[PDB]
Amino acid sequence: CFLAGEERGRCFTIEYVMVNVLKMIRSATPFPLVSLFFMFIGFILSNIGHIRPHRTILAFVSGIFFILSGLSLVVGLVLYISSINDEMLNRTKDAETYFNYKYGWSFAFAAISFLLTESAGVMSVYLFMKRYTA
Amino acid sequence: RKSKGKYAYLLESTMNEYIEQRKPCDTMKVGGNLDSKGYGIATPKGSSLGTPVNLAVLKLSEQGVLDKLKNKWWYDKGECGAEKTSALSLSNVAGVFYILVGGLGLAMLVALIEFCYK
Amino acid sequence: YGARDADTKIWNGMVGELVYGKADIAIAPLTITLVREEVIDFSKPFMSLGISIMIKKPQKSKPGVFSFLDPLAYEIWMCIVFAYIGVSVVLFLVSRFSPYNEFGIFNSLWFSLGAFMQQGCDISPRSLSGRIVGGVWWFFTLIIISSYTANLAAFLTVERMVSPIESAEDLSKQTEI
Amino acid sequence: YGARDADTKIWNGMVGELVYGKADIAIAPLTITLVREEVIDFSKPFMSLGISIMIKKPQKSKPGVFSFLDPLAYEIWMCIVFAYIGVSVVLFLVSRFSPNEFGIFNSLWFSLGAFMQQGCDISPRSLSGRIVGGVWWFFTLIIISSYTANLAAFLTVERMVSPIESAEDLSKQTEIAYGTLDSGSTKEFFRRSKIAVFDKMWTYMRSAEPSVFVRTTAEGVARVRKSKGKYAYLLESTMNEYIEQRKPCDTMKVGGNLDSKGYGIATPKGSSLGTPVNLAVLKLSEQGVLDKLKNKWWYDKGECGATSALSLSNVAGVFYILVGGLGLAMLVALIEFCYKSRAGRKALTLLSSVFAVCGLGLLGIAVSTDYWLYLEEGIILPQNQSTEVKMSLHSGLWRV
Amino acid sequence: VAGVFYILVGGLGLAMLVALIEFCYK
Amino acid sequence: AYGTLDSGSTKEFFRRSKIAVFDKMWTYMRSAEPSVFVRTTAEGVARV
Ligand SMILES: CC(C)CCC[C@@H](C)[C@@H]1CC[C@H]2[C@@H]3CC=C4C[C@@H](O)CC[C@]4(C)[C@@H]3CC[C@@]21C
Ligand SMILES: CC(C)CCC[C@@H](C)[C@@H]1CC[C@H]2[C@@H]3CC=C4C[C@@H](O)CC[C@]4(C)[C@@H]3CC[C@@]21C
Ligand SMILES: N#Cc1ccccc1-c1cc(-c2ccccn2)cn(-c2ccccc2)c1=O
Ligand SMILES: N#Cc1ccccc1-c1cc(-c2ccccn2)cn(-c2ccccc2)c1=O
Ligand SMILES: O=c1[nH]c2cc(C(F)(F)F)c(N3CCOCC3)cc2n(CP(=O)(O)O)c1=O
Ligand SMILES: O=c1[nH]c2cc(C(F)(F)F)c(N3CCOCC3)cc2n(CP(=O)(O)O)c1=O
């Protein structure tokens, strides 16, 4: 979605005709998806496991899915950031232009969601080993 | 300019040296020439001008006037002429991150496999 | 500039203004050609020229995945991997064939790994033959890690661009550009 | 080739044989000049050329196998070993005289893995031993940092080396002496040149001791070759491309041309031959025959042909020490278990005393003599860099 | 780099003193 | 970018100079966009 550059509120939500920064963040797309998929499957296994603690086996393989979510969230952020810097290199170098990237709060909440689902995974290995104890 | 170093344009060498001195400073002339040609001063066939013009071009060439005028219009009136180290970006060292997570991914497999199959 | 029509046989441009009579001289970038000097008189060339190649100036390259490996050639990184297997096998043959044990083939890989990444030990090889395997690989590591850092510092200090092509022989051989 | 004498006003070349009727055409590398086309005709140029620069094909340096030791002088690598002994010996002494896990076998091992910054297991539990380990810990911090920093300085200065690619590069960089043949169009180009680069180059060449001017082209090509990087020869573009293709394939042509000339075909100024010859040259130019003949005689009959990462040639002896370090370690596990499968102080008595007897003696015979320091000295000449010594010398601690 | 050698031997010289002194005066 | 006051002995020094350094400096200053020449000394001190 744009802003003051010609002031148009044209949320292009690109699927067709047109910059290439917006095509490189298309390349990094599957990694926050797989991370969100492993968060959700780590919790819909977690929510039922509060109802059924009965063997022990639940919160381990959900805690695998909490940790495997954050590791693919790292690769999500590294591919996202490097794709910016690859295209910030190739723009043009005049002494009369200025390009300024800046990461927003939508970037930051993805990075905060790393530390939560990793620390959730750490406690998820805790109480699995408490029910394997009991 | 708009092909990211994937289009090379074959053109005459005097324009190629001229566009190189324009703004932007984006283009570059490489190699030597491919053929050899010349630009001449033309007169009609049979003319009083022809022989003094031909002896004038040779006199301007050897006195250095024709080299002086080319430096003037191609280079002295040339826009292009003729630092401060930047921080390493993440795109330079993104490989040891992929080897790090790829090393942690291959390590959780060997954990989950072999302890079950003890 | 001046060319001759196939039908009308009339010279255009500055050439036809000399052939027909509008002008007395044409001071211009006008190419000395065979078909033109049959109808006018050129002087000697005031400017020599030819066909040349124009490319966009080389900028900083994009970094690949394995860009961090580039201070050392691939011939070195292979011979480090061969030597890492080489010093762990020899550390095993020190340990298996008549030791001073704890240094298995999986342990001798683990001593030589933290050796090359410069990360302490777990236990000293406690032989003498284990020590020479341990001690020489420690000097190997030091020279290789110092040569990585010193050659990367030279790269980051002196920006040195190269062009892909350098002639028209090069353009004919490639198909990328 | 042809030049009007100033006294007798008489041409003396191929221009002479056309003016004085001896010949009908001169098909030769004859430069289209003002003073020549006043007396003869010329065709359009069959070959364009100019003044170029001839340098030697640069060199590569050959890493002599232990080149990885080069960031530190050999006196440093020697005193590292003498300090490695010294720190090992002082460890074992301090350790025995303490309330041990350490032997001198272990004290050689603490001091090495601390040199390589690889950690150790045996800690010198005495605080008198902690002074031993701690100063060897700081010693190798300064030695490793000095190796990396002097190697970074080498590889940066070698990467800042820029070869000559223009006449402006020769204009600025005065470490390479550049010259011209002593009589011709090339020397008279710079002498009358009012272009700022070529005016500066003439100022260098006229005022240069020894003389940069050569007397023959073959003399000037030789002086490029026996100077290893230090001579550049200013000659014509077509001889530069031709000598580049000869044996030895030693020189190269750098830059573009410094001026523009042409070679023409000359006729005796009245001829009925002059106009068909002029249209022949323009037909052979646009049918590619004149470029075909240049490829044939410069390149198809040529006696020659036609990465920034660190290479294994440089770090080669660090593998040869590695193989030799593994090869010596196969010897130890052999003999030490052959000591174990077959498994006193009088040998300790004999060795300790007999080492001292030579030990007192070897320092004694050395300090009393006068061959501690050789010292050569002298001046060189560019005569194959052959050296005479105008000061040989010996030194002792007092006896010089 | 002659300074780290003098600090090395000067560090070994001050280490043999602390050895020879304190073990006698245990 | 180096410049001169637009009218005085300093500008006429470079304009008639046949010394190789000062001939090159005049070539830069006459052909420079935007203008390196200032109109007043106090203008030229401010632009520094
Ligand atoms: C267990 C792990 C190693 C699974 C591998 C998936 C991830 C980590 C890998 C490591 C190297 C990466 C690559 C690196 C960048 C390239 C070029 C880019 O334009 C698209 C993605 C692509 C083609 C790769 C895809 C994803 C990739 C991120
Ligand atoms: C236990 C040890 C430290 C005792 C000290 C004696 C030795 C090691 C010391 C360490 C530093 C040295 C110094 C270093 C060099 C300087 C300058 C020289 O022109 C004369 C000797 C002089 C002035 C010093 C004398 C000796 C000195 C060698
Ligand atoms: N820049 C950078 C960098 C950062 C960390 C590790 C390696 C590199 C790096 C090093 C080199 C190199 C090459 C030769 C000698 C020394 N260094 C090259 N590159 C690089 C940079 C851009 C594109 C491709 C490789 C690199 O990215
Ligand atoms: N290049 C390189 C290199 C790589 C690893 C270790 C040493 C070197 C090296 C270092 C030096 C040197 C010299 C002075 C100061 C600092 N360094 C020289 N050489 C070298 C390279 C080619 C030929 C001879 C020596 C070298 O090969
Ligand atoms: O006599 C000729 N002299 C020419 C001189 C030039 C110039 F370089 F501007 F001097 C050019 N251009 C080449 C680059 O694009 C702009 C025009 C064309 C010329 N042409 C036609 P072409 O060579 O057939 O294309 C002639 O015929
Ligand atoms: O018309 C001329 N054509 C020339 C052609 C050549 C050659 F390159 F061989 F074709 C040479 N040489 C340059 C160096 O190598 C040996 C002879 C000299 C020529 N000269 C005399 P210069 O230019 O006054 O020295 C002419 O006058």
Swiss-Prot record, chain A:
The chain holds residues 62 to 206 of 275 of the full protein. The L-type calcium channel is composed of five subunits: alpha-1, alpha-2/delta, beta and gamma. Acts as an auxiliary subunit for AMPA-selective glutamate receptors (AMPARs). Found in a complex with GRIA1, GRIA2, GRIA3, GRIA4, CNIH2, CNIH3, CACNG2, CACNG3, CACNG4, CACNG7 and CACNG8. Interacts with GRIA1, GRIA2, GRIA3 and GRIA4. The lineage of its organism: Eukaryota, Metazoa, Chordata, Craniata, Vertebrata. Coiled coil: none annotated. It is found in: Membrane; Postsynaptic density membrane. It comes from Rattus norvegicus. The chain crosses the membrane at residues 31-51, 57-77, 109-129. Belongs to the PMP-22/EMP/MP20 family. CACNG subfamily. It comes from the Eukaryota. Regulates the gating properties of AMPA-selective glutamate receptors (AMPARs). Modulates their gating properties by accelerating their rates of activation, deactivation and desensitization. Displays subunit-specific AMPA receptor regulation. Shows specificity for GRIA1, GRIA4 and the long isoform of GRIA2. According to PubMed:18817736, shows only specificity for GRIA2 and specifically to the form of GRIA2 for which a single amino acid in the pore region has been edited from a glutamine to an arginine residue. Thought to stabilize the calcium channel in an inactivated (closed) state. This is Voltage-dependent calcium channel gamma-5 subunit.
Swiss-Prot record, chain B:
The modification Phosphoserine is found at S3. It is found in: Cell membrane; Postsynaptic cell membrane; Postsynaptic density membrane. The chain crosses the membrane at residues 93-113. Detected in forebrain. Detected in dendrites of neuronal cells. Expressed in the pyramidal cell layers of CA1 and CA3 and in the granule cell layer of the dentate gyrus. It comes from the Eukaryota. The record marks K59 as: Interaction with the cone snail toxin Con-ikot-ikot. Disulfide bonds join C25-C80. A lipid is attached at C116 (S-palmitoyl cysteine). Homotetramer or heterotetramer of pore-forming glutamate receptor subunits. Tetramers may be formed by the dimerization of dimers. May interact with MPP4. Forms a ternary complex with GRIP1 and CSPG4. Interacts with ATAD1 in an ATP-dependent manner. ATAD1-catalyzed ATP hydrolysis disrupts binding to ATAD1 and to GRIP1 and leads to AMPAR complex disassembly. Interacts with GRIP2. Interacts with GRIP1. Interacts with NSF via its C-terminus. Interacts with CACNG2, PICK1 and GRIP2. Interacts with GRIA1 and SYNDIG1. Part of a complex containing GRIA2, NSF and NAPA and/or NAPB. The postsynaptic actions of L-glutamate are mediated by a variety of receptors that are named according to their selective agonists. This receptor binds AMPA (quisqualate) > L-glutamate > kainate. The M4 transmembrane segment mediates tetramerization and is required for cell surface expression. Belongs to the glutamate-gated ion channel (TC 1.A.10.1) family. GRIA2 subfamily. This is Glutamate receptor 2.
Curated annotation (Swiss-Prot), chain D:
Induction: Down-regulated in the pyramidal cell layer of CA1 in the hippocampus by global ischemia. The record marks R4, R191, K283 as: Interaction with the cone snail toxin Con-ikot-ikot. The chain holds residues 471 to 841 of 883 of the full protein. Detected in forebrain. Detected in dendrites of neuronal cells. Expressed in the pyramidal cell layers of CA1 and CA3 and in the granule cell layer of the dentate gyrus. It is found in: Cell membrane; Postsynaptic cell membrane; Postsynaptic density membrane. A lipid is attached at C120, C338 (S-palmitoyl cysteine). Ionotropic glutamate receptor that functions as a ligand-gated cation channel, gated by L-glutamate and glutamatergic agonists such as alpha-amino-3-hydroxy-5-methyl-4-isoxazolepropionic acid (AMPA), quisqualic acid, and kainic acid. L-glutamate acts as an excitatory neurotransmitter at many synapses in the central nervous system and plays an important role in fast excitatory synaptic transmission. The record marks I164 as: Crucial to convey clamshell closure to channel opening. Disulfide bonds join C249-C304. Residues 121-126 are cytoplasmic. The lineage of its organism: Eukaryota, Metazoa, Chordata, Craniata, Vertebrata. Belongs to the glutamate-gated ion channel (TC 1.A.10.1) family. GRIA2 subfamily. Residues 102-117, 118-120 dip into the membrane without crossing it. This is Glutamate receptor 2. It comes from the Eukaryota. Residues 148-314 are extracellular. The M4 transmembrane segment mediates tetramerization and is required for cell surface expression. L-glutamate binds at P29, T31, R36, S185, T186, E236. The modification Phosphoserine is found at S193, S227. The chain crosses the membrane at residues 74-94, 127-147, 315-335. Changing L34Y: Promotes dimerization. Strongly reduced desensitization.
UniProtKB/Swiss-Prot annotation, chain F:
The M4 transmembrane segment mediates tetramerization and is required for cell surface expression. Detected in forebrain. Detected in dendrites of neuronal cells. Expressed in the pyramidal cell layers of CA1 and CA3 and in the granule cell layer of the dentate gyrus. Ionotropic glutamate receptor that functions as a ligand-gated cation channel, gated by L-glutamate and glutamatergic agonists such as alpha-amino-3-hydroxy-5-methyl-4-isoxazolepropionic acid (AMPA), quisqualic acid, and kainic acid. L-glutamate acts as an excitatory neurotransmitter at many synapses in the central nervous system and plays an important role in fast excitatory synaptic transmission. Homotetramer or heterotetramer of pore-forming glutamate receptor subunits. Tetramers may be formed by the dimerization of dimers. May interact with MPP4. Forms a ternary complex with GRIP1 and CSPG4. Interacts with ATAD1 in an ATP-dependent manner. ATAD1-catalyzed ATP hydrolysis disrupts binding to ATAD1 and to GRIP1 and leads to AMPAR complex disassembly. Interacts with GRIP2. Interacts with GRIP1. Interacts with NSF via its C-terminus. Interacts with CACNG2, PICK1 and GRIP2. Interacts with GRIA1 and SYNDIG1. Part of a complex containing GRIA2, NSF and NAPA and/or NAPB. The record marks R15 as: Interaction with the cone snail toxin Con-ikot-ikot.
